[PDB]
Specification:
The structure is a homodimer.
Chain A lengths: L6 E4 L7 E8 L8 E7 L8 E8 L2 E9 L2 E2 L3 E5 L8 E7 L3 E6 L2 E7 L9 E6 L1 E9 L1
Antiparallel strand pairs in A: 1-11, 2-8, 2-12, 3-4, 3-11, 5-6, 5-7, 8-9, 9-10
Subcellular location (chain A): Nucleus
Main location (chain A): nucleus
Keywords (chain A): Apoptosis, Lectin, Nucleus
């Protein structure tokens, strides 16, 4: 039913295209389960990354003390309410000057291009997910 | 709805529990959170023995890697549901630690950095409407 993880795919992502990534979080093996998506400008692991998207599936909780006006050593964890992950659709739409990032149809960010979109040659998707679909749409 | 910020003189001996209930407010700021401070005095310039900050959204972090060097991170929070479901935060005072529970789930044991007797004031604020604040034992 799925795709191997890590998943690597040569891609062309011109303006007007969209990367659609769907899957289910795996919340049972690591304390800070996350999704990582990389857009590489070449085919090697050596090459530059035009755009990395990392999404944490938990809620960060940060604890600390303030002594003599100075915050001290931070202690952090990720709160995971439900123990099954909510299936997600990540959509990265390529606009002329930005990537428009949507999670479950909700726009969360507009990331201004730091390389021309045509520089992207390869997509990588990995970490704490069961991968269902990866496609490039228009 | 209790006023926010909510500040309360408290005594938190071993065996007590701070119970805070409310519902997140997700519509005014991009990174809605809950902040709870245990102060060691009544002044706002008092020391904080324990702060608990919870982000109601999911952090998403974006960056580029150029010449092998990660560059400037851009961060945002994904806020699903519709609005946040109500929450219960329980901070149990044990002999050596606070046991932090969210919605009945123990998420963290924070070792005391001050004797719990040092705590004199509780403050609860940021992006919540507050329903109850009580100290039980």
């Amino acid at each position: 039913s799925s795709l191997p993880v890590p998943y690597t795919l040569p891609v062309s992502l011109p303006v007007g295209s969209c990367v659609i990534i769907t899957g289910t979080p795996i919340l049972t093996f690591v304390k800070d389960p996350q999704l990582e998506v990389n857009f590489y400008t070449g085919m090697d692991e050596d090459s530059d990354i035009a755009f990395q998207f990392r999404l944490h599936f938990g809620h960060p909780a940060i604890m600390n003390s303030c002594v003599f006006g100075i915050w001290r050593y931070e202690e952090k964890c990720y709160y995971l309410p439900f123990e099954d992950g909510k299936p997600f659709e990540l959509c990265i739409y390529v606009r002329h000057k930005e990537y428009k990032v949507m999670v479950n149809g909700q726009r969360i960010y507009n990331f201004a291009h730091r390389f021309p979109p045509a520089s992207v040659k390869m997509l990588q998707v990995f970490r704490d997910i069961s991968l269902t679909r990866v496609l490039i749409s228009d």
